[PDB]
Enzyme design. Sequence first.
Site, short mmCIF file in Angstrom:
data_model
loop_
_atom_site.label_atom_id
_atom_site.label_comp_id
_atom_site.label_asym_id
_atom_site.label_seq_id
_atom_site.Cartn_x
_atom_site.Cartn_y
_atom_site.Cartn_z
N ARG A 76 0.82 -1.21 0.00
CA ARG A 76 0.00 0.00 0.00
C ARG A 76 0.85 1.25 0.00
O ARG A 76 0.32 2.36 0.05
CB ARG A 76 -0.93 -0.02 1.24
CG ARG A 76 -1.70 -1.34 1.30
CD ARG A 76 -3.09 -1.15 1.86
NE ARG A 76 -3.68 -2.44 2.22
CZ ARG A 76 -4.96 -2.71 2.27
NH1 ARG A 76 -5.87 -1.80 1.94
NH2 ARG A 76 -5.33 -3.94 2.63
N1 LIG Z 1 -6.75 1.67 -9.11
C1 LIG Z 1 -5.68 1.02 -8.69
N2 LIG Z 1 -4.60 0.90 -9.50
C2 LIG Z 1 -3.50 0.22 -9.07
N3 LIG Z 1 -3.32 -0.38 -7.93
C3 LIG Z 1 -4.41 -0.25 -7.13
C4 LIG Z 1 -5.58 0.41 -7.42
N4 LIG Z 1 -6.47 0.31 -6.37
C5 LIG Z 1 -5.82 -0.39 -5.45
N5 LIG Z 1 -4.58 -0.76 -5.85
C6 LIG Z 1 -3.56 -1.53 -5.12
O1 LIG Z 1 -4.19 -2.28 -4.10
C7 LIG Z 1 -3.80 -1.74 -2.79
C8 LIG Z 1 -4.99 -1.81 -1.85
O2 LIG Z 1 -6.01 -0.83 -2.27
P1 LIG Z 1 -6.81 0.00 -1.16
O3 LIG Z 1 -7.55 1.10 -1.80
O4 LIG Z 1 -5.89 0.51 -0.13
O5 LIG Z 1 -7.77 -1.16 -0.58
P2 LIG Z 1 -9.00 -1.16 0.44
O6 LIG Z 1 -10.24 -1.49 -0.30
O7 LIG Z 1 -8.57 -2.21 1.39
O8 LIG Z 1 -9.17 0.17 1.09
C9 LIG Z 1 -3.29 -0.33 -3.12
O9 LIG Z 1 -2.39 0.19 -2.17
C10 LIG Z 1 -2.52 -0.64 -4.42
O10 LIG Z 1 -1.32 -1.34 -4.14
MG LIG Z 2 -8.86 1.38 2.90
#
Ligand SMILES: Nc1ncnc2c1ncn2[C@@H]1O[C@H](COP(=O)(O)OP(=O)(O)O)[C@@H](O)[C@H]1O
Ligand SMILES: [Mg+2]
Lengths: 492, 467, 466
Positions: free
Chosen positions: A355
């Site tokens: 992340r």
């Molecule tokens: N649109 C995206 N493009 C590329 N990688 C993504 C994208 N969305 C999420 N990720 C990857 O997946 C990880 C987890 O997404 P995150 O938004 O933090 O999840 P959550 O739904 O748990 O809040 C991100 O830190 C990144 O590594």
């Molecule tokens: Mg989150």
Amino acid sequence: ADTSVDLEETGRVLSIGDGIARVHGLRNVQAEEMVEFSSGLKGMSLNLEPDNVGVVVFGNDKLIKEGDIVKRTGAIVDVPVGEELLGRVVDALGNAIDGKGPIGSKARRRVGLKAPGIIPRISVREPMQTGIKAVDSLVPIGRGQRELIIGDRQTGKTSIAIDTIINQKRFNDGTDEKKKLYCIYVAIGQKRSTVAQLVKRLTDADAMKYTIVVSATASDAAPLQYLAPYSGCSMGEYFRDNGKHALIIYDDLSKQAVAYRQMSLLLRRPPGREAYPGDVFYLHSRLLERAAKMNDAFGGGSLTALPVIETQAGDVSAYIPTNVISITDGQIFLETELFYKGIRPAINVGLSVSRVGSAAQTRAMKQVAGTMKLELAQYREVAAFAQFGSDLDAATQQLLSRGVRLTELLKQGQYSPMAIEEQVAVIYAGVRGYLDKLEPSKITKFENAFLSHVISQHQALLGKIRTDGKISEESDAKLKEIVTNFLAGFEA
Amino acid sequence: TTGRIVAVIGAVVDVQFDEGLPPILNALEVQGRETRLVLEVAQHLGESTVRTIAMDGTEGLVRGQKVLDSGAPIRIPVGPETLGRIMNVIGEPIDERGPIKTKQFAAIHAEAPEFVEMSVEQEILVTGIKVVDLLAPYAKGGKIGLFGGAGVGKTVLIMELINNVAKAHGGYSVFAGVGERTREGNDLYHEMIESGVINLKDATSKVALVYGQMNEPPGARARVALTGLTVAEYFRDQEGQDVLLFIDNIFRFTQAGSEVSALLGRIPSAVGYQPTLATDMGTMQERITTTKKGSITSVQAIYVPADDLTDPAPATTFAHLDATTVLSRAIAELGIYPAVDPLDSTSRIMDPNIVGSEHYDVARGVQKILQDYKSLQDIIAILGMDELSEEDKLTVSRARKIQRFLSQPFQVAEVFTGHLGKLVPLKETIKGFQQILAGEYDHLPEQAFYMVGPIEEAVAKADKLAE
Amino acid sequence: TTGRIVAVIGAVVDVQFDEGLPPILNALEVQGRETRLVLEVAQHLGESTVRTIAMDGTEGLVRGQKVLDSGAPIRIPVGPETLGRIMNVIGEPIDERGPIKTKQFAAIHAEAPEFVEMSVEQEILVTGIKVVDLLAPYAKGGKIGLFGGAGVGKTVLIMELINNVAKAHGGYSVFAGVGERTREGNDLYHEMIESGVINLKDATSKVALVYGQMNEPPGARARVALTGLTVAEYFRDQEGQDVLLFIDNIFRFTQAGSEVSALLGRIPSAVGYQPTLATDMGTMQERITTTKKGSITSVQAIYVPADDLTDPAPATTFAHLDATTVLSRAIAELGIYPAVDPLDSTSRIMDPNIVGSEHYDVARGVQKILQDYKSLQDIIAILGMDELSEEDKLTVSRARKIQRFLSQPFQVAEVFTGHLGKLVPLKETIKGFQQILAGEYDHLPEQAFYMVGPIEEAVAKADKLA
Ligand SMILES: Nc1ncnc2c1ncn2[C@@H]1O[C@H](COP(=O)(O)OP(=O)(O)O)[C@@H](O)[C@H]1O
Ligand SMILES: [Mg+2]
Ligand SMILES: Nc1ncnc2c1ncn2[C@@H]1O[C@H](COP(=O)(O)OP(=O)(O)OP(=O)(O)O)[C@@H](O)[C@H]1O
Ligand SMILES: Nc1ncnc2c1ncn2[C@@H]1O[C@H](COP(=O)(O)OP(=O)(O)O)[C@@H](O)[C@H]1O
Ligand SMILES: *N(C(=O)NC1CCCCC1)C1CCCCC1
Ligand SMILES: [Mg+2]
Ligand SMILES: [Mg+2]
């Protein structure tokens, strides 16, 4: 005339069973205050009820009887803390168990302190090099980050954390103090002989000198195993808050949750989902939030954490596992199928993540690994689909070729973490396409020889990449000349 | 009135009152503490004793410790003075910038707007995100929910939407950090200072921040959501002007409640949840809404435990939304971002009479070719492709292309994709998906459609792929 | 002093003491019984009352019956006098051969060896069983676990191991029957007399027996393992030598505990198990170990409820083993014995620096082809092998030949198979598997590799195939 046994500062055991003492009196005791049994045994006040105090015992309860005297300590549970713990093996309470004598620590810290909030922190940006190609390129970790290591038993989880500890020796023996990183290995629920082999492994590698080992093994009482993780974390916050950087491993939290469940059920707190306390998430979220990157105003130190979760039948999607994933700043998922096919480290690329991303990588590593994670995910998808004999255009054939080669370059043996400039060098040879025509079964031998070559004769190139933390146009031009020529020779 | 703590078990504290008994929901102040410790009255157990939930840790408390009734529910600062500031559950500043000099305060517990206060107007809010704008478009002043198991993209999507909608936005924004990552709060905060969305020097801040993360005990995570929506309500009502409200993650409100449920003496309902899940959720959610007085565009991230959308928490949440964006691990695992499930995302405005039959038909066409491939997949994985007709396999190849054209390089995601972020206009989305459906690209390779913006880049990538 | 029974429910008995309460773990003696009835203090309930667990039947107990505090935990006989003898949970002879006249007694409860007492020397223990030696080798003084569902072969395996290791062992052995078949105890006893490892006429016996079988009440079965391991602890230290400890079946320890827990007042944990499952197992397992003072090579048979390895009992046991031999029902049904799953069996000793790179590489190689075959089996289930690429057909072929070469006739099963048992030397095991992997036998028929010893027997059999 004898007022040493009043019921405000002392109490008496009403009943005792299964590590739970019900105490009469202790009217002035605080919630979460350490208390002491006549026997020398310590315990913690968790339940403050109108007629009794519910006490959790930190040791063998066989020593407590009805009527015993219980005394207040006036202190919320805490443990010894500081540099005097480096190179030592201690129990959950901070006591030495390595037979090397008392720990002469000059400071103590509460095991339950809340994590730093918004203000004292600053974005994670300093690399925390595991020295593992697949991790450092695909799921990079930065200082103050939290990154989960999860997978069925025997998939390689502990191994990732050990190599990671051993890897820091580069910096710990170095001169740049900012690069130093002290290590903490918290053993929970494990077998004592396993922990001993472990510390013998770290000693032989000469890593024990910068590591603290906190051990609450399988025969230690439930409350001891529950505390262990918080204890080592406090030892870690000492560095974090004094301008230094520490790395912590909780191996593992699955067993810590089982002990929490035991202690909680014995306190009569009604069970929740899967028989765990309804607050298992908070058990772990609380702990891991303590790993953080501090701002310069706060010393700029940090604490990095690598918790471990053991799955059952490769089910990352279950309850306990998703809870912890929902806390950490990423996860490294390992599967037994890959481990047996020869993919070691057995990382599943689509299911693992970081992340923090490239913000935890040097420019160099970003220059070679930037789009590789998504690409390898697409590669595995199309590879499965192509098995359907379908006609393949040049585009997919090239993706397959590229994917199979990179898969080989991310293979890595144990106990030999690589310097970042060296990983950059071997990644480069694949990502730049130079190996697309080399037989895949030759890629491991190529890497071993290519690497010894550049290390033997190209220390200047390796040193420039490491010093500039990037691949200059000049460094780029020299690598091309080295790989094309070396390859040709190799294929002779 | 003054009380005395008679019991402490985790976050649940029992207090005894000799005289006046504070009513359910009142805030009690604990005496003898370094920092303000508030207890919220949940029940009256009888015998002049009340049961409460603490808003901060209970370590250090002793039986017999004095407690004062403030004579009211938790009240926080509301108004222009909260803009650019960070508050906690109980309205205290946590940005180390001093007192929030507001002229008014407001209780975080309030009745929901009546049925006569509802609005039915509904207009498209374009996000620039191809899958959303195309398949399940958001609406101005509508309720939007982003569902997702752990780590599938909820937060990255909300951060992207803030970037594409809230920067341009001329009204005010409220962001509620609810039981999520503290690191994320320090991230967002510095992000917003950079974008000038938050200004520490003048008074041009356009966003208010409220936080109660996973480092806090359950009482605080169970009420911080209320705190944040309470701030938003003032902008809606005491100013009318348009309001944006972002919540990451409102599931955490429901989980907090379940952490203390058994301590509150309840018999567990299915899956270990509190028997009051639905009603608890209703009285909170019914406050997050546009009314005749003013508009609120709400975007709420919604955690899905064990990746199971039938879980009571997420399952009871679908009914409070106008547009659902469902994220899937099976899709994220394939490198497809945003990992939106095209066959499980919906919008109340996906109607030909609202978006036009061109928009409607293409969306509907995309859904059909995908459900058809999905139904096909397992069959060909066994009998191979050769048994399909030239047309049956022409849909297999377009389906895969369309699935790839749904992916997109997010601006906010640069640190992950290694690609320059992209924003695609609605018309360009419809056009592009329309052309693939029509066959106008059957000669380009799949990967050309992967991770790009407009359909032109697909053509250009294909060229870059040729040689 | 004396106490009195205030309550009785199955194995759980409550006793009130007007003067002097007996500490947790103490052994109490019930009065007015024809045979010794021991009660073990589990907890202090309050109001001068204690909750205890009976070590034998509670039928006939009456409210008011007198109970005596023995002043210590259950103590049993230990030393050279236990050899050739059979004892029960509480140290009493059950072989009808008179009193066990030892000079030493020991409590069946005790703290596990300390961290500073752990040993880190790793040395292989060659069993002569191909699957085990190759893929997940056992270690001298290490902990070995044999997992298996009902009637999959746990007992046969432990017996073969006694036959292959215990006999050729200089030191002493301890066999502990825990919640298993009594007649299996009768067979074992008579088998050992026949072979001379037990002698009723001289002092040459080499094995000590401890039994608390499936005819016993919960408290007894929950403690017999402690009794058995207590005898082994003596030989480990109080003689400074090498000891073998065999236990069939340690699962029964956790099951028995599950029975009383239901009566001790505990709120149940997952699948109805006691909440203390992991710690109960922990304080017991941590005593079954090698120390710097002496070594214990332990072999524990582990039952798997409903064939579910995620069952809390088995799943918690993995953490206590140095080598794991997982038996499979699907393998046994294929006729392959021992029914060891080659991909789910592990050893902390499978390391190039311990077994050598040749041994190490041959094992990784076998597991690699087995896993590749496994990944194919899904596509073979519908269409079959005829639809595979001429290459996958090849991995399939070698894999199937390897699966059968892992099979082997046991000496201890001769009595029913009709085939002479076999013992293959480690060097012969590596080689055989190398040759199959290298393709040297792609021309030999599968059946040639099934149920033989060394590679040469495979070729010979491939010849008798005319
Ligand atoms: N649109 C995206 N493009 C590329 N990688 C993504 C994208 N969305 C999420 N990720 C990857 O997946 C990880 C987890 O997404 P995150 O938004 O933090 O999840 P959550 O739904 O748990 O809040 C991100 O830190 C990144 O590594
Ligand atoms: Mg989150
Ligand atoms: N990169 C690697 N290459 C080869 N073998 C490896 C590698 N990493 C780990 N192993 C081996 O895999 C085995 C299992 O590793 P490890 O103990 O770390 O897994 P685990 O997940 O922690 O299992 P456990 O359930 O025992 O905790 C060990 O023999 C170890 O040496
Ligand atoms: N090595 C073996 N060779 C042949 N048959 C075996 C072998 N192991 C087990 N079996 C078969 O399985 C039966 C059950 O084995 P046993 O060890 O008694 O089961 P359990 O796993 O319940 O202890 C044996 O009677 C025999 O028919
Ligand atoms: N970052 C983000 O939204 N902040 C920046 C991005 C670049 C342009 C200015 C704002 C995200 C926060 C959540 C995790 C992923 C990145
Ligand atoms: Mg491990
Ligand atoms: Mg058996």
